[PDB]
Amino acid sequence: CELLGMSANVPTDIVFSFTGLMQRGGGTGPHRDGWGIAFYEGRGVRLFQDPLASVDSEVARLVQRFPIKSETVIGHIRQANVGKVGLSNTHPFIRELGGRYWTFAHNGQLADFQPKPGFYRPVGETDSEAAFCDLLNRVRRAFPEPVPVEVLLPVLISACDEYRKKGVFNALISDGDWLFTFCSSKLAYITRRAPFGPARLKDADLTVDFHAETTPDDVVTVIATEPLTDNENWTLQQSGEWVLWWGGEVLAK
Amino acid sequence: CELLGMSANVPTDIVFSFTGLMQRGGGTGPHRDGWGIAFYEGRGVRLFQDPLASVDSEVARLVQRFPIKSETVIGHIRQANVGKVGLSNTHPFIRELGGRYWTFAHNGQLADFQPKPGFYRPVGETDSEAAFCDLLNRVRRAFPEPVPVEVLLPVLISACDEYRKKGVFNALISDGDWLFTFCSSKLAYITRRAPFGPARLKDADLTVDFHAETTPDDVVTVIATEPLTDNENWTLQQSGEWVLWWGGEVLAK
């Protein structure tokens, strides 16, 4: 329950409910693991994130109080405390390329990763952000001008392939239209077609509720590190498998 | 009371109490004028823009608070409901250059403004974002590698000067460290030195509260389109005047 995405064909509701901190057996006791949730409202993007916390922060309250409704959502919950702290090291990451805001979320670890500095440079010290910028540099070099998805698709797959050669590289990328997924370790998804009733996905210290259909033609796909609902149409992805989503539909894989 | 920035030498609290919607004589009646606030936490940045709700059943004046703590804040607290201009057209704008997140807020109108497309491209349709991207392109072209503020200072002044030849260009720029200001029409500031007591800046449908000093060495400068407190040490800026802040202190002007 780390990576979490959504691609829909209509702006759909998503309520995040972080269970307030509590004394437990292990997980989210006096503290809380870092999280991040980015989503789109047209071409614009909203980002709410927070690194390791020993209190129920204002940003954590902000995501919950905001009536969210989008077609593209990328998030990363319970990000490994490994390494360094701070906001600059919290997923997901944003950067504009071609007049579109790109969003990136990575789960896993990369060993001996040292990409050549380019146009885009990481602000933080994460290997995830270094990977994001590098991938962005390859897309910018190979395609100076905006090019349709299928064209820039090969460069995406290529970079992901190389990164997985140095460690675990599960990732979610989006320019606000499509939502690129890549599995190295584990990733899963489930498409829901109208008519559908409200569903409640949940972690151990999190709950994301979904409502009923807006129109009789709704299609909404949820992507997670692993099924959050008792296996239904939850399809499990294998190592090396990528999928390009857009409008909740599979474009290519 | 549109632009509002802050440069301080220690992370200082700033609470924004947006006076909830109410039936008035003219201003923020059933609707709400947009707003946007960005602030840093180290090198990372946070961006909050007005929620796409405002449909509060027009219940009696319900003020909503927004606590913020930072050394660098840049905001545009008087725009149009995000539902009217759209999220991609809401200030301030963010983009990374040289491994730092650059924030930008601009007040004023530009006529016949048509910068040549470059590295950075506006996601939205404002002349403001078009201006931000152009200024970033000039900096990236003139400075391929990270350079001290003083060196990149001239290019910032040049760009602003050019944009002011085509309209009003009051702007606030920042990389997380320093806060650049530029005046064309009107801009003002007031530096507060420890010891100082809590202050309450207020708009007509807003209130931004400040607290007492954290340490006896505090220095916090507030920049606004015009004095929010009954004139004290509020220094008024004239057309063509710029100031580079850092830790609440004037670096250059």
Side-chain angles (χ1 to χ4, degrees), chain B residues 183-247:
Chain B
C183 184
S184 275
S185 186
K186 60 196 291 75
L187 203 64
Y189 65 85
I190 185 169
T191 313
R192 289 160 64 230
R193 299 159 181 296
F196 54 69
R200 160 170 277 225
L201 310 189
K202 93 162 314 182
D203 201 349
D205 293 303
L206 170 68
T207 295
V208 26
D209 295 271
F210 287 91
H211 303 163
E213 70 286 331
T214 298
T215 78
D217 304 304
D218 286 16
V219 181
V220 2
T221 296
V222 178
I223 305 143
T225 281
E226 62 184 359
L228 294 162
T229 294
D230 182 53
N231 294 99
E232 325 176 52
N233 275 74
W234 275 103
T235 298
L236 296 198
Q237 290 187 220
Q238 310 144 225
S239 182
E241 300 185 334
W242 55 274
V243 180
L244 184 63
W245 298 95
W246 191 321

Side-chain angles (χ1 to χ4, degrees), chain A residues 41 43-46 49-50 58-59 65-66 87 95-96 99 101 119-123 129 140 145, chain B residues 41 43-46 49-52 65 67 82 87 95-96 99 101 119-121 123 129 140 145:
Chain A
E41 217 160 281
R43 284 173 205 228
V45 56
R46 295 191 186 269
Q49 73 200 318
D50 210 34
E58 201 72 56
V59 56
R65 57 190 289 210
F66 183 90
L87 183 62
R95 226 143 295 207
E96 82 94 5
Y101 286 119
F119 311 110
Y120 299 93
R121 301 188 186 289
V123 180
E129 185 175 9
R140 177 123 230 130
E145 293 305 297
Chain B
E41 208 161 287
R43 295 182 189 220
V45 60
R46 297 185 188 273
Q49 289 146 135
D50 74 283
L52 214 171
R65 269 174 46 106
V82 97
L87 185 64
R95 225 82 124 215
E96 81 96 350
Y101 288 116
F119 192 60
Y120 301 95
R121 302 185 181 300
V123 174
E129 190 179 352
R140 177 173 240 62
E145 288 302 307

Side-chain angles (χ1 to χ4, degrees), chain A residues 191-212:
Chain A
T191 311
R192 296 160 62 238
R193 297 161 186 292
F196 52 69
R200 161 168 281 216
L201 311 186
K202 90 291 187 225
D203 209 345
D205 292 299
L206 169 79
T207 278
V208 37
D209 297 280
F210 289 91
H211 301 166

Side-chain angles (χ1 to χ4, degrees), chain A residues 165-229:
Chain A
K165 169 266 172 184
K166 285 175 186 169
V168 177
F169 194 73
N170 300 292
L172 304 179
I173 306 166
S174 174
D175 79 336
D177 285 333
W178 43 265
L179 176 37
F180 180 69
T181 74
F182 187 84
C183 168
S184 236
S185 183
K186 46 161 53 282
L187 194 65
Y189 63 87
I190 185 172
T191 311
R192 296 160 62 238
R193 297 161 186 292
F196 52 69
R200 161 168 281 216
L201 311 186
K202 90 291 187 225
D203 209 345
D205 292 299
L206 169 79
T207 278
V208 37
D209 297 280
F210 289 91
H211 301 166
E213 77 280 335
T214 306
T215 82
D217 311 293
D218 285 19
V219 178
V220 4
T221 293
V222 183
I223 307 151
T225 283
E226 64 189 350
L228 300 166
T229 291

Side-chain angles (χ1 to χ4, degrees), chain A residues 88-89 91 93-95 97 102-118 120-140 155-173 180 182, chain B residues 96:
Chain A
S88 59
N89 294 314
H91 299 43
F93 303 104
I94 308 180
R95 226 143 295 207
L97 196 163
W102 278 52
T103 293
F104 179 92
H106 162 225
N107 173 244
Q109 308 176 331
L110 306 178
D112 192 76
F113 191 59
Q114 31 64 105
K116 310 170 305 304
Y120 299 93
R121 301 188 186 289
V123 180
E125 308 83 49
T126 50
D127 276 349
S128 296
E129 185 175 9
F132 183 29
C133 294
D134 187 71
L135 174 149
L136 280 175
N137 289 164
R138 300 173 174 223
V139 174
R140 177 123 230 130
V155 57
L156 294 180
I157 310 164
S158 293
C160 284
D161 259 313
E162 272 204 59
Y163 303 151
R164 83 200 219 81
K165 169 266 172 184
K166 285 175 186 169
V168 177
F169 194 73
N170 300 292
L172 304 179
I173 306 166
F180 180 69
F182 187 84
Chain B
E96 81 96 350

